[PDB]
């Protein structure tokens, strides 16, 4: 604040900083930023205080449960620094109100997010604003810090990482190998009975499966939603028809069909102890019934969203998953465990975050001292690596000349049949999926620049069904996907190819 020393303290005081997220890392970060000197800080978060956040996020107290993180955050902080000039936004960072001009305001940006999706959006914004971005993360005892600067280092997407964990409908509906396969199976089943029927998230055995070259809200409502009726169709009839496909069942252990009748013939935490098949079969019936009773209160026509903190919902998935596992000779797991998996809960503790945040400010001080080339990705280990290092520091790498984002003139070639691929498969399986674009604005880079897809609703709605050829798109065509909010453009070279493969809509040139 007063000793750190002159030229540095100058920017630390006047400079304006932005912190994205006020959870574990966030709170610790604020405490430091402020104590270190930074007085002009802008906070942003889209969540409310939870009683579980009370073991690390010390800016919050029991009395603040339910309130806005960002809000309370500012309050708490202003206590041990009344002179602090803070501004908190209780809202998502994905919000279009926070455009490049907003980001270009700050001299430094720090992320404290808990998902790739946000990290991606923030990564691009800072590139567009060309403002230093300090990216971090933690998990249990592990965690890391790194710096990102357009043109200088690699961006958070020079080596693309998944925003979510995708699973093949094959091993999910036909051959579950990991316990997670059953829990996911359970979730679809949940979204197929009480939620939005997702065609992709089916549940019944698939006939058009590669492994076994063969020769469910329907069943639900047709049977009046009877647990027993269902049980026998999900853990007996379906499994039986599953065995019918002796192709997919060659060397791999075959499932064991169940029967509601037979089944009914048998200190850690309450939710840590596992129960017996029957006990779950009954929970399976008890949950379903209780679920529909709740869904009967939610207006008329309202669907249900699965939530790890919803008891009845947790009971269903827990039970459904275990029953599914038993059938596949996989050992059943407790509720506490299935909760973490179905809810992707990330084990968090204060110390681990407290470390990362300290490191963040340290890299920031360097960056503001014009010592960016001294910054580096730091890793926090649990046990000292062979060199006695608990905190592993490694240099920052240069931009990837083939990154689909930070590159100078992002461009790529997409091979696919311009006669079979619909305008939707483009805006969904390619532009949004592969290239990772949430708000696409594709157009044909031709003499007229035809608009094929628009981000704004009620415009390019009547095209999702049409064929790409219908728009004159052909071999050699050049498409331009844009995301103005992020000032991101991606030239897409179309390379027509009919005889490409099976079930392979398209394919980017550079993958295997």
């Amino acid at each position: 604040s007063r000793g750190l020393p002159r030229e540095l303290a100058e920017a630390v005081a006047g400079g304006r900083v932005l912190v994205v997220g006020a959870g574990g890392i966030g709170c610790e970060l604020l405490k430091n930023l402020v104590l270190t000197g930074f007085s002009h800080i802008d906070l942003i978060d889209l969540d409310t205080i939870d009683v579980s956040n009370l073991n690390r996020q010390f800016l919050f107290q029991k009395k603040h449960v339910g309130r806005s993180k960002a809000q309370v955050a500012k309050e708490s902080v202003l206590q041990f620094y009344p002179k602090a000039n803070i501004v908190a936004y209780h809202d998502s960072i994905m919000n279009p109100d926070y455009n490049v001009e907003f980001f270009r305001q700050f001299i430094l940006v720090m992320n404290a997010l808990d998902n790739r999706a946000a990290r991606n959006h923030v990564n691009r914004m800072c590139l567009a604003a060309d403002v230093p971005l300090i990216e971090s993360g933690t998990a249990g005892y592990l965690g890391q810090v790194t710096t990102i600067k357009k043109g200088v280092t690699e961006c958070y997407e020079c080596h693309p990482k998944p925003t979510q964990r995708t699973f093949p409908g094959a091993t999910i509906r036909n051959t579950p190998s990991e316990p997670i396969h059953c829990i996911v199976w359970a979730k679809y089943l949940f979204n197929q009975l009480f939620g939005e029927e997702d065609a992709d998230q089916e549940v019944s055995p698939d006939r058009a499966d590669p492994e076994a070259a063969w020769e469910t809200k329907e069943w639900a409502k047709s049977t009046g939603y009877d647990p027993v009726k269902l049980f026998t169709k999900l853990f007996k009839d379906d499994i039986r028809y599953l065995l019918t496909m002796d192709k997919l069942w060659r060397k791999r252990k075959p499932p064991v069909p169940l029967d509601w009748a037979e089944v009914q013939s048998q200190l850690g935490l309450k939710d840590q102890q596992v129960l017996d098949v029957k006990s779950y079969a009954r929970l399976f019936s008890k949950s379903i019934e209780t679920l529909r009773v709740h869904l009967a209160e939610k207006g008329d026509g309202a669907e249900l969203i699965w939530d790890k903190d919803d008891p009845s919902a947790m009971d269903f998935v827990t039970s459904a998953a275990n029953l599914r596992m038993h059938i596949f000779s996989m050992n059943m797991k407790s509720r506490f465990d299935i909760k973490s998996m179905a809810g992707n809960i990330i084990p968090a503790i204060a110390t681990t975050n407290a470390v990362i945040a300290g490191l963040i400010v340290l890299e920031g001080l360097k960056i503001l001292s014009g010592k960016i080339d001294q910054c580096r990705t730091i890793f926090l280990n649990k046990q000292p690596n062979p060199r006695k290092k608990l905190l592993v520091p490694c240099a920052l790498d240069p931009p990837n000349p083939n990154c689909y984002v930070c590159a100078s003139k992002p461009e790529v070639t997409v091979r696919l049949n311009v006669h079979k691929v619909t305008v939707l498969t483009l805006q969904d399986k390619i532009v949004k999926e592969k290239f990772a674009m949430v708000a696409p604005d594709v157009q044909i880079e031709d003499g007229k620049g035809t608009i094929l897809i628009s981000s704004e609703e009620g415009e390019t709605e009547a095209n999702n069904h049409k064929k790409l050829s219908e728009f004159g798109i052909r071999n050699g065509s050049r498409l331009q996907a844009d995301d103005f909010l992020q000032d991101y453009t991606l030239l897409i070279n179309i390379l027509h190819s009919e005889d490409l493969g099976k079930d392979v809509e398209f394919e980017v040139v550079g993958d295997a």
């Binding site: 010390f58 300290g358 000292p384």
Partner: protein
């Protein structure tokens, strides 16, 4: 479980990490922490959140100015009061479940009996003499001992758990019983660089160890740590101490670059945070008896961003 239903939700995330039994052992441990400065507060807060049975913050020093913008556990207007008490309230709110107590007597006068009421002692800002003294009392009374400080972009943490036996986990999950042995702090600070096991490691040994030496001497010869308010005066004396101390251990003063005096003054918040979380996590491992503790020194250098675990003394 065997813990409050409420507590089951408040500690859920950490329970999903080190397990319910660990939290229990932690819920049944009292910690003594002396020195309520940056590192102090950081440490206090980390434990109070963790959920220990109770924490006693000892400090007889007054709340001198320049504390508000360095200590978040004190009120903007508390200049002139006891550093410990001043932190009480806020620290206490961090987590009601824990009983935070405050003592205001010079740790030196304290009788061996006073220390037997705690499960782990953690000192800060103390002089070597006080450090060895407490480390010695704890040993004879079978008490986990921790100490550590911060200076500029550097900081350190030491541990002496004696005959420490714990349980790890390597696999379905299976616990395994391992045992580790620590040594006196005096033996760690006074190493013989003539031994073959020494000279044959002095190379791979972080100079931060010798940095601590020099500064420890400073705290002794003088009655405070170096200060920017007296940079030149202190800088001159420091380099000198480097020569004196090092010309004794039998090593060249080169091992500690003369520029070391540029990055070792005052208390840097981010440093306290880093060092504090590391120390506080070691205390928790020792109290929950889960996972291998760092034997036995930990040196942090904010400049290069390195966290080294050294083992000196044996």
């Amino acid at each position: 479980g065997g813990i409050s239903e409420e507590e089951a939700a408040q500690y859920d995330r950490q329970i999903r990490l080190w397990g319910l039994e660990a939290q229990k052992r932690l819920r049944a441990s009292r910690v003594l922490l002396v020195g309520l400065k940056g590192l102090g507060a950081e440490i206090a807060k980390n434990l109070i959140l963790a959920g220990v049975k109770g924490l006693t913050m000892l400090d007889h020093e007054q709340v001198t100015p320049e504390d508000p913008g360095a200590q978040f556990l004190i009120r903007t207007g508390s200049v002139g009061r006891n550093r410990a008490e001043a932190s009480l309230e806020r620290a206490q709110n961090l987590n009601p479940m824990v009983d935070v107590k405050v003592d205001t007597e010079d740790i030196e006068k304290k009788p061996e009996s006073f220390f037997t009421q705690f499960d782990a002692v953690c000192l800060t800002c103390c002089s070597r003499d006080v450090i060895v003294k407490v480390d010695q009392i704890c040993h004879k009374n079978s008490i986990k001992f921790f100490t550590g400080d911060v200076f500029g972009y550097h900081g350190y943490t030491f541990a002496n758990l004696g005959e420490h036996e714990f349980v790890e986990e390597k696999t379905e999950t299976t616990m395994v019983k391992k045992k580790v042995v620590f040594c006196p702090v005096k033996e760690a600070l006074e190493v013989d660089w003539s031994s073959e096991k020494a000279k044959a490691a002095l190379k791979r040994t972080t100079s931060d160890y010798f940095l601590l030496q020099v500064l420890l001497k400073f705290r002794t010869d003088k009655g405070r740590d170096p200060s920017s308010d007296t940079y030149e005066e202190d800088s001159e004396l420091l380099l000198q101490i480097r020569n004196d101390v090092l010309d004794s251990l039998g090593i060249s003063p080169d091992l500690l670059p003369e520029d070391f005096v540029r990055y070792c003054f005052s208390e840097m918040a981010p440093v306290c945070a880093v060092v504090g979380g590391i120390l506080a996590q070691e205390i928790v491992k020792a109290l929950s008896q889960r996972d291998p503790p760092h034997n036995n020194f930990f040196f942090f250098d904010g400049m290069k961003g390195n966290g080294i675990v050294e083992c000196l003394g044996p």
